Design a protein around this nucleic acid. Structure first.
Ligand SMILES: [Zn+2]
Lengths: 140, 101, 128, 142
RNA sequence: UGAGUGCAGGGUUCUAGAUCUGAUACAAGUCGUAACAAGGCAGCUGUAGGAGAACCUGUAGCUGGAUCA
RNA sequence: ACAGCAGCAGGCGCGAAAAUUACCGAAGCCUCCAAGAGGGCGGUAGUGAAGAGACGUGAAAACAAGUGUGUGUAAAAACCACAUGAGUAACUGGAGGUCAAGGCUGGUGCCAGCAUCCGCGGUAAUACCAGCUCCAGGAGUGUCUAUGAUGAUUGCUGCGAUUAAAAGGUCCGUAGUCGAAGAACAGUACUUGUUUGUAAUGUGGCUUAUCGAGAGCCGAAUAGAACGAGAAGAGUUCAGAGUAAGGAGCGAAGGAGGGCUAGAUUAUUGAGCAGCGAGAGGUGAAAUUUGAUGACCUGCUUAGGAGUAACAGAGGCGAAAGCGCUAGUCAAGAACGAAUCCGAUGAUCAAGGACGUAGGCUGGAGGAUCGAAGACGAUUAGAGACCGUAGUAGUUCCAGCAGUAAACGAUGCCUACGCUGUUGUGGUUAUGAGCACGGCAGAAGAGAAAUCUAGUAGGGCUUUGGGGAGAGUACGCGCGCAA
């Protein structure tokens, strides 16, 4: 394939090789639009339906606080994590929450939380960081 | 990792070889791999030759010998102690063994 | 069959490494002659004899102490005068010395003569 | 290397540096030219013509005296064969193998040799029917 | 020149489904112990039977073997 | 009856996502029968930390932002000039390592939480929650999401395939990519001149807004096309030329290479008959089991179906799978010797075609030995297994199907350049040596090492890998009687 007039053979061969890369393959041949946050959108709105808790992976020993969210844009139901110290207390059933990604290349689990892929950002139009640290109050 | 340069056998420039059967357990082993042993044993034991000298009718007599070639598989040769495990530099030394009696 | 200009290069490179002063090279073509004659002009090789054996051809050559390395490029890429310095920087060790040889309508010439004559060509080989 | 098998033999014979004229010989030009054309009409292949000239009449490579090649002389005399002698010897070997297999059908080694032989025939045919030495629709005797 | 609309078919993409069958994670549940030491019948590859379950048995092969002899 | 905002404002929805139902006889342009009329085209401001410049938040004597006039414009506001007051003006992320900066004090005790990654916390936490001091950037700083770089982890330049992932079981073969020396010839590619071909952007500059982005003027330019020029490489032809390129042929010889015909020495079983009169077999040790219907062992007769011991090897032959008794017969091949003939006929290979141990399947022949399945005897907690007794399909042959192996020297095929000693096999020999096919032991280089079919290298062509798993699995398709 290294001959001077071999360009056609060379091009067709090298194109076919790239499908061995996971990155190129997923963009070409996988379902890249299945996710609430990803290629489609940076943030997602949804309504809280259940409060939930999950164990951390070994060797850690903890209960992590999680929320069941119905996503307006897809009608899927997903699990999200609630970040801050007393954070679970700032959320009621049937509140609206905005939800965000964990920051890995694909949608992947982070740290010791098994199988959860998003986190809460805002509750009832206001920043959760401000709610928890008592800098601002619920809209009421 | 590769333990021996010759793969533990004497086959070179061939596809396939005849098999033979182990004396101790009848397992099949390739002829070019089998451990071989030669025996030349008198029909009459050394502890009887002094009686033979008065028993025989002939003026002189030569005792008949019996001849054998025996074959062994690796497991049997190691267990019967025809061969032993050796160090990484000793493995390379090749010398002909004695004929047994 | 091997390329004759590749064979020439490996034959002299190995013999130089083995610290021999002379070699016989066994298959020769028209551009092989011109390549060797180039190395003689720049003082990389000293003496050349050609044997007219009626079987292809063969050469006997004396090496100098100045030759570090030579090589052929395959295939022989076409280059504009704008392109040659890219290949110069890729192949040669220093901006101060060594030769990159190019075939042209004016014979074999080096990367300096290309500037003088204002011509590109096809890339052939190098030595330093 | 060899074309149908893994051979790398090197047995050949050296061609001389210069050819001269064979003054040690005991015949004229015209006699040698007569000897060739006789051997030709009797039906000998041109490679055998060469062997006889060397062995019996004492002339090496059969060209130093004539300034002309054996097959060209046969075309000048009009004695040219219908098929080139190489392609002709390939058809013969094929026929032989098919005549063996016709009675000893079980021989897998002979079957193997036939498919090799047959391939070589068509590769040679395509050479000659490009140089206009055979009619375009020529086919094997099979 | 033709919009619209009947009636059959196809081509695509999604979705329902009694029931069955994969995979993955199961702090540590039950039964054995197949592999790693000659792992207690040296191991492994193909093929064919058999079996709660790892697996076992015939046949040809390999050493990555416990032998460069 | 009327009606169609992917015109300008504006509203509702949808979403993670985007401004005023504002002024306009002025600037740039367009339209008419016009010393005039029209234009949401266009211009002017308002709104918003998408982007980009220049500067405030003090100095050691003495500091923005305000205000009033003038300007500015279509009218304005801002900008600039002079004149008045004065003394206002920092946050975001961090402080165990990567990675700049605290083992400080108090709470909490695998809780609550933190942490991109590695990891912290079970009562002595520089990592959680706070106080206090430090660090970094600063009118800005954190997070999420696509992409370029990191990355020689996509490799033209420039990676890999003995053992880490990775050379097709072996051949034939089309399309495709790649192809001697010598003497000559021609100009379409190739390279280059002149002329065309670029507003903005970008590039090399200079000049004016306090400065700096900004604005204004200049010069050269890509790919593409027109006409000339040069002939090294590539291309075409020739034969008083004949490759350590190929094919055809000659001579003497070598080999478990293959098909067929006709024979052979023993051995293992089975029957017949004769002799003898009590055990044989099997194991680590034993039991199933067989024997007075005479076993076992020793004779003589016979009947079958497999196989070729010892010699026999780091020996030979074959494309691989594979091939071992003796004669006769039938085709083709490899190597060697040499002054035979033809002349580029060649390398590698998608598609397509032929062979392929064993086990398996369809039909016929046959059936000694061995033995999956099945059945017993022992051993064990249990053995369905390992061991022993027995026993069927298969194991052999002819005519076919099938298409897999740790089909391995785990090392593709042609072709090169390469140190020494020793030992083989077959020819030839000036007897000094060579040519083809091997084994072995060092060296030098190489490599993560072990080691070396792995040294040197932009030679040609095909196959093939890209962190573990799921998975060589699902759906579709092609072959097969099925597997
Ligand atoms: Zn044994």
């Amino acid at each position: 394939m290294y001959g001077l007039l071999a360009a056609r053979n060379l091009k067709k061969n090298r194109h076919k090789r790239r499908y061995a890369d996971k990155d190129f393959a997923k963009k070409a041949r996988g379902d890249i639009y299945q996710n609430a946050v990803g290629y489609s959108a940076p943030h997602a709105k949804g309504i809280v339906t259940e409060k939930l808790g999950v164990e951390a992976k070994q060797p850690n020993s903890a209960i992590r606080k999680c929320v069941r969210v119905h996503i307006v844009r897809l009608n899927k139901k997903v699990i999200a994590y609630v970040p801050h110290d007393g954070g679970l207390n700032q959320i009621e059933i049937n509140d609206e929450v905005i939800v965000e990604g964990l920051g890995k290349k694909g949608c992947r689990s982070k740290g010791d939380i098994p199988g959860v892929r998003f986190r809460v950002c805002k509750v009832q139009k206001v920043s959760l960081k401000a709610l928890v640290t008592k800098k601002k109050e619920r809209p009421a | 990792t590769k333990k021996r340069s010759n793969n533990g056998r004497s086959k070179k420039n061939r596809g396939h070889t005849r098999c033979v059967r182990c004396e101790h357990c009848s397992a099949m082993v390739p002829n070019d791999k089998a451990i071989k042993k030669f025996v030349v044993r008198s029909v009459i034991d050394a502890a009887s030759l002094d009686d033979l000298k008065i028993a025989t009718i002939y003026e002189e007599y030569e005792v008949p010998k019996s001849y054998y070639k025996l074959n062994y598989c690796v497991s049997c040769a190691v267990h019967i102690k025809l061969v032993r495990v050796r160090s990484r530099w000793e493995r390379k030394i090749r010398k002909e063994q004695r004929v047994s009696a | 069959m091997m390329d004759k200009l590749a064979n020439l290069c490996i034959t002299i490179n190995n013999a130089n490494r083995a610290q021999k002063r002379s070699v016989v090279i066994r298959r020769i073509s028209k551009v092989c002659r011109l390549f060797l004659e180039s190395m003689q002009k720049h003082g990389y090789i000293t003496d050349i004899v050609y044997i007219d054996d009626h079987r292809e051809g063969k050469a006997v050559v004396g090496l100098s102490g100045r030759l570090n390395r030579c090589g052929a490029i395959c295939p022989r890429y076409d280059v504009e005068l704008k392109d040659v310095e890219r290949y110069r920087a890729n192949l040669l060790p220093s901006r101060g010395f060594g030769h990159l040889i190019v075939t042209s309508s004016k014979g074999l010439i080096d990367h300096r003569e290309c500037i003088q004559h204002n011509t590109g060509g096809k890339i052939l080989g190098y030595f330093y | 290397a060899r074309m149908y098998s893994n051979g790398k033999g090197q047995s050949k014979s050296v061609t001389p540096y210069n050819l001269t004229y064979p003054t040690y010989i005991k015949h004229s030009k015209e006699e040698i030219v007569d000897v060739i054309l006789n051997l030709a009409r009797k039906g000998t292949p041109p490679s055998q013509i060469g062997n006889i000239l060397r062995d019996n009449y004492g002339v090496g490579k059969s060209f130093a005296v004539t300034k002309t090649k054996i097959l060209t002389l046969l075309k000048i005399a009009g004695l040219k064969p219908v098929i080139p002698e190489d392609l002709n010897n390939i058809v013969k070997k094929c026929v032989n193998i098919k005549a063996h297999l016709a009675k000893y059908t079980n021989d897998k080694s002979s079957k193997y040799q036939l498919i090799q032989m047959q391939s070589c025939l068509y590769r040679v045919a395509r050479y000659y029917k490009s140089k206009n030495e055979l009619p375009a629709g020529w086919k094997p005797p099979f």
